[PDB]
Each structure stands twice: as structure tokens, then as C-alpha cells.
Amino acid sequence: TCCTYNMETRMAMQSRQQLEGHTKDQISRMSGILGSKATKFKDIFTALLKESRTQFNSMFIRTYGVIYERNSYVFSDLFKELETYFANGRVDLLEVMDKFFNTLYQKMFTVLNTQYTFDENYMRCVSEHMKELKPFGDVPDKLSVQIKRSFVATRTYGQALTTASEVAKKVLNADCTGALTKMQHCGACKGYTEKPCTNYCVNVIKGCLHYQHEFDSEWENFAMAMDKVAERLLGSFNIVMVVEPLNIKISEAIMNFQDSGQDITNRVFQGCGREPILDRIVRDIRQRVKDYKKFWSNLPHSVCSNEDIASSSDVDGMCWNGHTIDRYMHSITTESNPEFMASQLSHLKNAIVHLRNAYNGQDVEW
């Protein structure tokens, strides 16, 4: 033997802080990029939603005049629900849209039929028949489903990014100590200058970070679910195509009532009687989430390739293998190491469930 007992104990602290150091570095930078981009995304969306509110109001004062001004609260209350949802997620978007178009129809029926008089009992009959008569055509039905799908998927995209960044921060083991020093510093113990075999170093580091094994496979499902949601956000659930021309979609529902106002009244009378910045940010995050899919499994390979360890290949047999200067005679482990959190997993598993519901156009309770 070429080392003492306390030389080995000194090399046990040096080997520990090298791996713990490199890991904490990679984790904090990834968690940093993910968290900062979550905030940027949430910012670009609130900006787009405030732009839509201002443009909606300006268009409506200009096109509808005092009919709009008198009832502006109906439209301003709608923007508040959409704002609150993105902030809280508590609002039921389909109920809100149903109520809005119901209120819009009652106000508009009364306005047109100034000539006639309607009490509380009459107007209740008018609302009961609304979905049977289709006053705004198929807009309320189609628009409400678009709002729900795009708002749910947009909010979940930002939330899942926040909780990924958060859960990575909480990841920040006795058997490792023995295998780590024996790999890094004990070649020299037998009077050797040869660097450790790469596959040896990889197996050792996989055993050290065996605690991130459950977590790594779930990070992969997370990246796969985050990629499907980004695909829907750029595609079929595109929120810019919903929010930006929202004033045009609502004016077109209004004109649908005006153009058939005569027809509507007759049917009632029988019943009762007398490139966008958010698209750029999604495309960007999407790529970074794709490049981070195998972040956890690449950690042993990242550690071994560094100037710090500078591990050598097996191919020539000129490396430290745990016994001598020879070829490391073990294959890399997959799915029992030859060289040898539950909350974070659940917080990540729940995010995946929420991303799945968002990509399926289903409800998210988060």
C-alpha cells in the first residue's frame, strides 16, 4: 500500500465535495433557466391579455358607441375572469362564457325590441330558449371550447415549468463514499499514474446518484408531456389566435344577431308571447426542455469527461479499474450495480398528470 489511513480519509472528503459540487452546479443552472423562462412566459401572456383588453375596449367604443359604453362592465367582467383564471386557475371558463353570451343575448334582445315591454318572467323564457334558438349561431359553442382549451394549456405550461425548476432545486449516501474514493484516488494507492476507466467511473457515479433514478425516468415523461403541450400551444390550442382577435370573434357573434334580429324575435314570440412574442417564447422553452430530457442520466457522463477526473477509455487497458491497470470487465447498468425525494417524485408526477389533461383538452384541478 502507498497511502495511509488518514490519507484515504483526506481523499474521501476531496472526492465527496467534487461530485457534490459539480452536481449542485448543473442543477442550479438548469433550475435557473427553467424558472426564469416560466416567469418570462407568464409575463408575455399577461402583456398579450392586457393588449387584447385595450384593443377590445377601443374597438367596441368605436364600433358600438354608447350601446357598448352603457354595458361595458359585461365585457370588462369577462376580461377579469380570464385574468383571474391565469393567475388563480379557480374560475370555470365554460360557465363564464355560457353566462356572458347569455347576458349579451338578453341585453341585445331588449335593445332591438325597444317597442315591446318585458318583465322578469318574460326575459327568463328568452334565456331558457337561447341554446335552442342559436342567436349568435355556433360561436358561443365553438369559442368557449377554444378559450377553455387554450387558457388551461397556457396556464399549465407555465405552472409545470415553475414546479420543474422548483422540484430540481429540492434534489440539491455512505456506499458512494467507498466506491467514489476507490475510483478516483486509489489507483495512486498501488503506485499508478493512469486515469480511471470511463465505464468504471460511470457505474460508480450512477450508484452515487441512484437516488435520482426514479426521478430521472419521470423527468423524461415530464419533457415528453411538456413537448406535447408546446405542440398544442403552437398548433390547435394556439392562445394568440384566441385572445388577439377576440374583439373580431365577439363582433361577428353580435352581427350574427343583428343580421337575423327579425328572424330571432319571431322565434322568441312563438315561445313566450308578446411571429407573436408568445409563439417565440414557446418555441424556445420547447427546445430547452427537449435538451434537458436526458439531463439526469448524462450527469455521470458529464462528471467523468471533466478535466477534474479526465477518465480514460477501456479500449487499451491503460486505466484504473478498481483492481489494477486493466480493462474494466463490467457492462454499464440499466434495469444491480457491480460497483456496489418521494415528495419531489409525486410533485413531478402530478405536473405530468396536469400536462396530460391540458394536452387532452380536459380539466386541470391545480
| Opening angle at CA 62, ends 61 and 66, nearest 5 | 45
Question: Any long-range contacts for 52-60 (C-beta under 8 Å, 24+ apart)?
Answer: 52/79, 52/243, 52/244, 52/246, 52/247, 53/79, 55/247, 56/246, 56/247, 56/250, 59/247, 59/251, 60/247, 60/251
Q: Which three cell numbers stand for residue 162?
A: 415553475
Dihedral (Cα; 45, 46, 49, 53), 10-degree rounding: -170
Resolution rounded to one decimal, in angstroms: 2.4
Q: Which amino acid is located at 336 in the chain?
A: S
Whole-angstrom Cα distance, residue 182 to residue 85? 55
Whole-angstrom Cα distance, residue 353 to residue 286? 18
Whole-angstrom Cα distance, residue 339 to residue 203? 7
Whole-angstrom Cα distance, residue 236 to residue 239? 9
Q: 149 Cβ partners below 8 Å, 6+ apart?
A: 232, 236, 237, 361
103 pairs with which residues across the strands?
A: none
**Residue 154: closest CA among 37, 238, 248, 88:** 238
Q: 244 — alpha (psi -120 to 50), left (phi > 0) or beta?
A: alpha
CB 106 within 8 A of CB 126: yes
Whole-angstrom Cα distance, residue 321 to residue 329? 8
Q: 309 — alpha (psi -120 to 50), left (phi > 0) or beta?
A: alpha
Place of cell 398579450: 48
Q: Which amino acid is located at 62 in the chain?
A: R
Task: Residue count of the chain, please give it.
Answer: 366
The 3-class SS string of the chain reads CCCCHHHHHHHHHHHHHHHHHHHHHHHHHHHHHHHHHHHHHHHHHHHHHHHHHHHHHHHHHHHHCHHHHHCHHHHHHHHHHHHHHHHHCCCCHHHHHHHHHHHHHHHHHHHHCCCCCCCHHHHHHHHHHHHHHCCCCCHHHHHHHHHHHHHHHHHHHHHHHHHHHHHHHCCCCCHHHHHHHHHHCCCHHHCCCCCEEHHHHHHHHHHHCHHHHHHHHHHHHHHHHHHHHHHHHHCCCCCHHHHCCHHHHHHHHHHHHHHCHHHHHHHHHHHCCCCCHHHHHHHHHHHHHHHCCCCCCCHHHHHHHCCCCCCECHHHCCCECCCCECCCCCCCCCCCCCCCCHHHHHHHHHHHHHHHHHHCCCCCCC
Compute φ and ψ for 206, nearest 5 degrees: -65, -40
End-to-end CA distance of the chain: 60
Which technique?
X-ray
325 pairs with which residues across the strands?
A: 320
Place of cell 341554446: 131
Q: Which amino acid is located at 280 in the chain?
A: R
CB 44 within 8 A of CB 277: yes
Q: 195 — alpha (psi -120 to 50), left (phi > 0) or beta?
A: beta
Whole-angstrom Cα distance, residue 87 to residue 105? 29
